[PDB]
Write a protein that binds this ligand. Structure first.
Ligand SMILES: *[C@@H]1O[C@H](CO)[C@@H](O)[C@H](O)[C@H]1NC(C)=O
Ligand SMILES: *[C@@H]1O[C@H](CO)[C@@H](O)[C@H](O)[C@H]1NC(C)=O
Lengths: 51, 48, 50
């Protein structure tokens, strides 16, 4: 949360800025903190197709 | 060449014109205007 | 006028207008402050703005 706060305070949400984070960093997909920038990409396990 | 080229242009798109040659007879580029502090054009595009 | 009067190959990076009457003005200013890479900056302000 602090990292995203710093990033969007400096202005790291511009074009071309692609962010890739693992499942531990992003936590749970349903819980979306307000610090999450638009177009944020994460990597996790198959939670939808792999029931 | 330019004379009959412009007459062909006048025949095509129907304009009126005058023709005359330049005084200094020179192309013109960015040069200092009589050892001043200004670099400007001269010649055809200088007066254009 | 003078920088193009001398036709040598200058390089003007950016020109900045600052708004201190708005608190969000500084946050807006941060975007172009991110574009600060030239080692020399020409300043225009008063002392309190300085
Ligand atoms: C070009 O065509 C126009 C339209 O008919 C005509 O009035 C004119 O005489 C021609 N050229 C000029 C400008 O004299
Ligand atoms: C050349 O230009 C200067 C101004 O920059 C003027 O004072 C001077 O009289 C001019 N001389 C000629 C020959 O044009």
């Amino acid at each position: 949360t602090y990292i995203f706060e710093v990033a969007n305070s400096v202005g790291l949400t511009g074009y071309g800025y692609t962010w890739i984070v693992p499942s531990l960093v992003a936590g749970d997909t349903d819980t979306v903190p307000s610090e999450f920038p638009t177009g944020l990409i994460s990597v996790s396990y198959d939670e939808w197709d792999y029931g | 060449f330019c004379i009959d080229l412009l007459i062909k242009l006048a025949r095509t798109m129907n304009f009126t014109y005058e023709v005359h040659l330049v005084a200094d007879g020179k192309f013109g580029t960015q040069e200092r205007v009589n050892n001043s502090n200004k670099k400007e054009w001269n010649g055809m595009m200088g007066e254009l | 006028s003078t920088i193009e009067n001398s036709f040598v190959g200058w390089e003007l990076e950016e020109v900045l207008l600052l708004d201190m009457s708005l608190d969000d003005g500084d946050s807006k200013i941060q975007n172009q402050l991110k574009k600060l890479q030239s080692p020399i900056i020409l300043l225009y302000c008063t002392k309190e703005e300085a």
